[PDB]
Symmetry: C3
């Protein structure tokens, strides 16, 4: 049945409620224009599924254990991904072989073979149950495994030179929704630039060479301590780009932080270290290995971003929401008009028609 | 033109439609108060961009191949990240050298040199085209590469002791929106605690030491089988925290599962294994290597979470949505009033004014 | 006070505005039925927190440096995760030892000891400050470190055979919201299938064997060049599944691309390479190593997806939004009726009641 309903309406002409209503409407409109559209950029589509690729390479040489250490000695793993370690401190145990020997840590002290049992399984290898002489002063439980066991009585030095190593970060990102590609290596970067650019998160965001010490400082850490305990530093690269502006306005934002925050607050586990071994065998069949306890700084490059570009659909939908919402003022203007205008009684009479039954 | 419109309204006074309308309104209000605000916590802002850091360390010793294996023998890779493997089974091929030799697998059986060609490229090295004697009973295609080739006729044992290794998980998380930091190592964790805490997802979520066997059990797996085939276990740590409550109420939730689910359902690929080599060279220039086929359990620690905290903006917006929505009952109350109240005719007459032209 | 308000309404009976109003309503309804419900599937819940597991294994043998290279020689790292490298080109420096020696790169050319200082820290080891003879024609700064240093005067060949290696991808995914599990290895995959299936993103998405050369081609790259410079290829596996259809309708979508896009656009850094060393020691205590500069293709398997399944809550909410929105046509029908129907004056008179004071 083709019939169109529309409500009968009172049309007050008082100047007060006119200005007040037009004012409330102007406030709604201004809120949508200023906050929903400008600040929150509701007029554009957003891409958050950013595709990122990170390739890294470290350079620098250091003196440690009276030997020169280069990238292949101190960076692990070696494949140049977004997570890698620069080893800044080591505890080395040369020429371990499978056999029997006493633990060196005082935590394994024994006077009699009775104390050597399941109560102290952690560390070294498997206990024999015997109690043996580590030195003339100390006696410890005998173990079968890699011998001799490691010793941690005196602290080893750090590789101070590591503060001066360089990290090359080649980062490529793409917002697929807009088919947009950019990286921190601009296409006009020259060999000279690589030789002389000085990275700074504000002054030069497109220099791909970062000094380790600078990264540690930006993260609010003291290299002397971090290199002693080890830790984890995050290099966050953010691509928040407004594709309505120029390609050259899309700029990476570098943040630096320490990620293993629980470590600084903990007396039981203060840094980051791990153990690995170099494996050898003699001309004879038998095997031997060097055990290494490495302390270092773990870097992981975390890439995030979102892009926005003007689109008609969201603009239409959002403006429709604006116009639909401009009406909401009628509840306020109604309270005011019907209850606080000294002419309220007349308006209440004209607006409401009571009914009974 | 400062003019304020408002609609003329009928004001029924029937008790039935009064109670029914106030009831529908109470139902809307109660739905918003109970579901939108309480259950869905629409009164608070949410942070989902959680920053997580995971450091791991394994401890334990085992007997395998009549040698003691420690962390550096059986964990790979070694850097203590959120993904690592404990090797529970091995197939070892000692002292391989570059040369010529016959394949040992029956899948390469040949009677004549004709059968040795491109049809069987997988495995070993490059075929010479010749057919040679592996043993007096079996003959196989000759290959050039690492010799001798590996053999898989009889199954090797697993490292049962691995069920007893321990995994140390130091996890640090931060919700940046609220500048909130916490980890599974509480600041009051003591050396005694580390020596004696018993991890349980409910009874002790802040014990950082997890027993491998316990992890395998929580994931509904049988260590005896998993260690034979290899597999992938996920340790999920969830931080779902209501920052309106106390910091100490923010607690990690551990889940355990097997991630390579396709493996249990497959007859062709049942677990997880990989090959690597230890490289050596003699006093002579020539090189030789030990080849290793490792079966093990891959652990990856997956950290997720979201935080919520009271904020005024979303509370205002949501309550505005509540009041705006309370009106929607008028369509129902209209159907009822106008069509099912026995006094309907009068109301239809008072409400509608027909027009023609 | 149990009172029910309802507005007094004009009820035009003109056929024109009847058809026009019913038409606008039909357009709103059709927009919701066609776009909000069908295309955008607003009638179902969505799971985006997909759980994915990837296990990889490479197979193939190649000839390089007149030796046969198998998986343990050219894949790194070895643990078969979703990111791995196939090494396609190498620069080998045999039997390095700690000592003194001259740089070989012309970039370190010196005539006098004065030029050997901090200005050229990158590369090799630590400068002694002396200027020494590399050859009768060239002189370079002496360094202390691993000797001899590497040389890059003539380009080494690539491992062409790598185009023919195979990548086994076992991918298991689970949408937890719907407790849905599936992988690219179907449970009915047979050894024959593994021996003979030919992967294609459209014709055979469930073949888990991918030929390296095919992956390089799908990513729009030339193996001859990529294997020379190195690079990063992404294998994206997308699980976009409508759980209202059959389990067997849930199919993976393979995409291939090159992720280090900045490399092709850059003259300073064109590919992907990294350095590592094989470590040895003689019967004597002293150590020596082989240094390797590896160029290769990095593959990382990126798994994404979202699942949707019918649910009552979102259907109710969305249909409620449809009916609520069907009214919005009244502003348009009002403009038309009140201003463009030649009978407008009568309607304006019936609808509006002016008031003054
Ligand atoms: N898997 C594990 N099982 C039991 N205890 C562990 C484990 N991993 C670490 N720990 C203990 O937790 C504490 C902190 O570990 P952390 O690695 O930070 O210090 P550490 O002195 O390097 O430990 P260690 O030298 O024994 O490897 C130490 O007492 C350490 O022995
Ligand atoms: N890259 C590849 N190319 C061809 N076939 C492969 C590849 N990777 C694995 N396969 C085959 O898929 C099947 C399952 O592989 P899986 O690694 O689970 O078992 P496997 O017995 O350890 O295989 P293998 O011992 O040959 O490495 C095996 O038949 C294996 O040969
Ligand atoms: N950590 C770093 N510090 C300084 N320069 C670097 C660093 N990493 C790479 N570079 C330089 O950036 C340029 C591009 O590096 P890339 O690795 O792509 O090429 P390359 O020729 O393999 O470099 P190299 O052979 O010196 O390792 C080269 O000139 C290289 O020396
Ligand atoms: O500037 C190039 C850009 O123009 C258009 O975008 C507008 C944008 O909407 C405005 O906010 C303004 O600040 O920037 C542009 C006007 O110069 C389109 O995005 C497109 O045509 C083009 O990329
Ligand atoms: O507004 C962006 C919009 O993009 C897509 O919508 C497309 C649709 O995919 C096409 O079929 C086309 O015909 O209509 C739309 C044109 O923009 C997404 O499907 C949609 O989710 C997204 O909002
Ligand atoms: O309790 C400390 C906390 O108080 C405030 O939060 C309220 C919260 O809104 C209530 O739901 C209640 O359950 O908890 C708190 C009242 O004790 C604020 O969040 C803030 O002042 C403070 O952190
Ligand atoms: O409601 C949370 C809100 O936080 C931010 O809004 C800020 C804004 O960034 C500031 O400029 C400030 O002046 O106004 C708001 C105060 O909360 C986010 O911009 C916004 O997206 C988010 O909703
Ligand atoms: O088909 C099995 C499936 O049926 C139901 O889903 C409907 C779906 O809503 C329709 O769009 C249609 O295309 O597919 C199904 C009708 O065959 C339920 O999802 C459930 O009972 C079952 O899984
Ligand atoms: O519509 C999906 C819905 O799922 C969950 O809602 C559940 C709720 O968790 C249960 O307590 C149950 O009693 O009520 C709902 C039944 O679907 C989520 O809580 C909610 O966020 C989600 O929308
Ligand atoms: C170690 O042996 C020495 C002599 O061999 C002697 O001092 C003592 O018996 C042992 N040490 C301890 C602490 O018992
Ligand atoms: C870092 O290098 C500069 C010269 O490039 C040198 O002056 C400084 O001492 C170095 N720092 C350390 C800790 O060696
Ligand atoms: C390289 O191009 C970018 C892109 O606009 C520009 O900002 C930069 O100034 C250019 N570099 C030089 C040295 O001109
Ligand atoms: C091999 O010879 C070394 C001495 O050079 C000896 O220490 C080792 O025990 C021998 N092992 C075997 C198995 O003969
Ligand atoms: C292997 O050689 C032996 C003797 O050298 C003999 O049995 C036979 O010729 C070969 N084996 C087969 C299966 O042909
Ligand atoms: C694990 O350790 C306990 C003692 O700590 C021992 O009783 C048990 O036999 C061990 N399990 C295995 C499989 O060795
Ligand atoms: C450590 O602090 C947390 C934080 O409230 C608390 O729950 C726990 O009981 C404390 N531990 C001890 C041993 O008091
Ligand atoms: C090196 O010597 C060993 C014997 O010790 C021999 O097997 C090998 O073939 C020799 N290789 C070369 C290149 O001389
Ligand atoms: C290298 O030494 C040779 C002779 O020892 C001689 O040609 C010259 O002094 C040196 N080369 C240069 C370029 O000076
Ligand atoms: C790849 O293998 C086929 C046979 O399987 C062979 O014809 C082709 O030459 C190989 N490609 C290369 C580059 O060796
Ligand atoms: C294996 O099962 C899937 C699931 O429906 C099916 O699509 C496929 O055709 C099956 N394979 C064979 C060989 O029947
Ligand atoms: C070890 O012996 C080799 C010769 O075989 C010699 O080159 C090296 O300098 C020696 N090193 C030491 C520390 O004796
Ligand atoms: N301002 C509102 O949310 C009122 N809405 C109606 C509603 O969703 O309840 C108008 C609309 O968006 O169509």
């Amino acid at each position: 049945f083709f019939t169109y309903e529309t409500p009968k309406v009172i049309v007050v002409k008082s100047w007060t409620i006119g200005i007040i209503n037009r004012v409330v409407q102007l406030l709604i409109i201004s809120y949508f224009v200023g906050w929903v559209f400008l600040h929150e950029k509701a007029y554009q589509v957003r891409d958050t599924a950013i595709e990122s690729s990170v390739v890294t390479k470290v350079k620098g040489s250091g003196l440690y254990a009276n030997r020169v250490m280069d990238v292949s000695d101190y960076v692990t793993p070696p494949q140049g991904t977004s997570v890698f370690v620069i080893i800044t401190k080591m505890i080395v145990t040369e020429n371990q072989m499978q056999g029997f020997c006493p633990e060196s840590e005082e935590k394994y002290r024994c006077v009699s073979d009775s104390q050597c049992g399941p109560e102290r399984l952690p560390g070294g290898g498997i206990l024999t149950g015997r109690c043996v002489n580590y030195s003339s002063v100390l006696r410890t439980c005998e173990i079968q495994g890699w011998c001799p066991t490691e010793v941690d009585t005196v602290e080893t030095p750090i590789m101070m030179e590591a503060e001066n190593f360089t990290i090359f970060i080649k980062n490529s990102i793409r917002f697929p929704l807009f088919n947009f590609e950019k990286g921190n290596l601009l296409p006009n970067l020259t060999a000279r630039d690589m030789k002389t650019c000085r990275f700074h998160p504000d002054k030069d965001p497109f220099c791909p060479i970062l000094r380790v010490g600078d990264v540690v400082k930006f993260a609010g850490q003291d290299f002397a301590k971090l290199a002693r305990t080890g830790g984890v530093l995050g290099i966050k690269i953010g691509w928040v780009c407004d594709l309505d502006k120029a390609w050259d306005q899309c700029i990476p934002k570098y943040s630096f932080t320490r990620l293993d925050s629980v470590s600084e607050k903990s007396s039981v586990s203060p840094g980051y270290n791990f153990r690995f071994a170099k494996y050898y065998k003699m001309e004879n069949g038998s095997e031997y290995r060097t055990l290494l306890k490495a302390f270092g700084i773990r870097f992981d490059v975390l890439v995030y971003g979102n892009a926005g570009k003007f689109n008609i659909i969201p603009t239409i939908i959002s403006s429709v929401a604006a116009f639909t919402s401009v009406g909401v003022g009628t509840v306020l203007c109604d309270i005011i008009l019907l209850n606080f205008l000294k002419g309220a009684d007349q308006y209440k009479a004209k607006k409401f028609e009571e009914v009974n039954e």
